[PDB]
């Protein structure tokens, strides 16, 4: 289930507004559980630091 995806760091995945799913690699994360909280959840065009480390 896609909803099953929860912030890997927390696991509550209840913050609908802050839970961002990384398509590159990371599964689910919160804007605050990542790096300095982002202004908002990107419109589907973003990646987490784990995928960036690849490059």
């Amino acid at each position: 289930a896609v909803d099953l995806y929860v912030c890997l760091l927390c696991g509550s995945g209840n913050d609908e507004d802050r839970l961002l799913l990384c398509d590159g690699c990371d599964d689910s994360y919160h804007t605050f559980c990542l790096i300095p909280p982002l202004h908002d959840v990107p419109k589907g065009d973003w990646r987490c630091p784990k995928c960036l480390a690849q490059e």
Binding site: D3, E16, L19, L20, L21, P42
Partner: peptide
């Protein structure tokens, strides 16, 4: 990024 939500009923 895609938004995801999670809630439980009880």
């Amino acid at each position: 990024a895609r938004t995801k939500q999670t809630a439980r009923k009880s």
